[PDB]
Every structure is written in C-alpha cells, then in structure tokens.
C-alpha cells in the first residue's frame, strides 16, 4: 500500500520483461544457425536427456532452426521425434522436412518441388544414415504456406532407435549431427 503497490509492480515489471529477453535470445540463436545455400547441419546436444523426454512422452518432437535455398529463397526447417512418429513410433527415429512461411513466398514458384536429402552423420565418417525424396506436388506439405508452418513430411522410419543410441559413432559426447541438403536445380 504505502509504496509496495509500485515495487510489487516493478517486480511484475522485471518478470514480464524477462520473458521478452527469452524471445530475443531465441531470435539471436536462430540468426546464428541460418544458412542460405540449401545446406544445413543441425547439432543436437544433451541427446540422452532429450531421448528420455521423447520416450517418457513428455517431448515428442523438436524443431530445428530455419534455413533457406537462397538469400531470398524458401524458408525451411526440420523436425525430429527421437522416439518415432506414425509407423515408426517406439522403433525408429522420425525425421521430417518443413516448408515454413517465408517473407518472400509471393515471389516464389509453388508448389515446392526440390529434392531433399536427409542424413544422420556418423562421427567416424564411415557409414552415414542417408535418405532422400522428391516432393509430393499435390501434398499440402508443399503448397504455398498459409500458417507459420505446413505439415511436416519426410521419413517416419528414418533410422532404427537401436542403431543410433546403443553405441556406434552416431552419438558421441552426448550429441548427434543431422544434415539436410536441398537440391537447387531450377532455382
């Protein structure tokens, strides 16, 4: 009452602002991971922990930062379910491709029709887990975006949970590396 209606209000100030700071840090982190040539390497740390959060049903899937086909090209990002989705639930590692709403969409040709290659890098450069595909032209996943993101589309059975995790060379120092390569032919 005396002068607490202000301080107990400043505390609500610091607190309602502290959330804006979390936003900004997220945007800076995003600019730092963005690429503009269609190639994107995604490092995932605290693999052990994040694997549990998937199995324990707590956190099913994670999105990766965005990247583009060119400075003013398509905006995209990946989405992974460390414990499977659809046909690969509890058995495989599900990796998907996402076309996001980009600031230059109006200037781009649709639907999205570029080959996409996805891989789980073997930190021993021995045998990489690779897979590729050509967009399903009629699928809503590759039409000009209306929302922030379209429906992810990719490889629900990308890699057997047993293959990675276990040991091998895919997981090393509690972290993995996912790679995507978007073919630029035509663009």
């Amino acid at each position: 009452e005396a002068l607490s209606s202000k301080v107990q209000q400043l505390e609500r100030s610091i607190g309602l602002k502290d959330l804006a700071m979390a936003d900004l840090e997220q945007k800076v982190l995003e600019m730092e991971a963005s690429t503009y040539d269609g190639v994107f390497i995604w490092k995932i740390s605290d693999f052990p922990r994040k694997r549990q959060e998937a199995v324990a049903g707590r956190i099913p899937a994670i999105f990766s930062p965005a990247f583009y086909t060119s400075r003013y090209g398509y905006k995209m990002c990946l989405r992974i379910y460390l414990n499977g989705d659809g046909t690969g639930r509890g058995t495989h590692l599900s990796l998907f491709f996402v076309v996001m709403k980009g600031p230059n969409d109006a200037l781009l040709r649709w639907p999205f029709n570029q080959k996409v290659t996805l891989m789980l890098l073997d930190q021993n450069n021995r045998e990489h887990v690779i897979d590729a595909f050509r967009p399903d032209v009629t699928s809503s996943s590759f039409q000009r975006p209306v929302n922030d993101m379209n429906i992810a589309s990719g490889c629900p059975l990308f890699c057997p949970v047993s293959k990675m995790e276990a040991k091998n060379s895919y997981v090393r120092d509690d972290a993995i590396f996912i790679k995507a390569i978007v073919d630029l032919t035509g663009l």
């Binding site: 429906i151 589309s153 629900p156």
Partner: peptide, 9 residues
Amino acid sequence: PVQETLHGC
C-alpha cells in the same frame, strides 16, 4: 515423403 502424424507431437 510420408507426412507426420496429427497427434504424434
């Protein structure tokens, strides 16, 4: 490509 599941996430 196979689309992701509506519920999965």
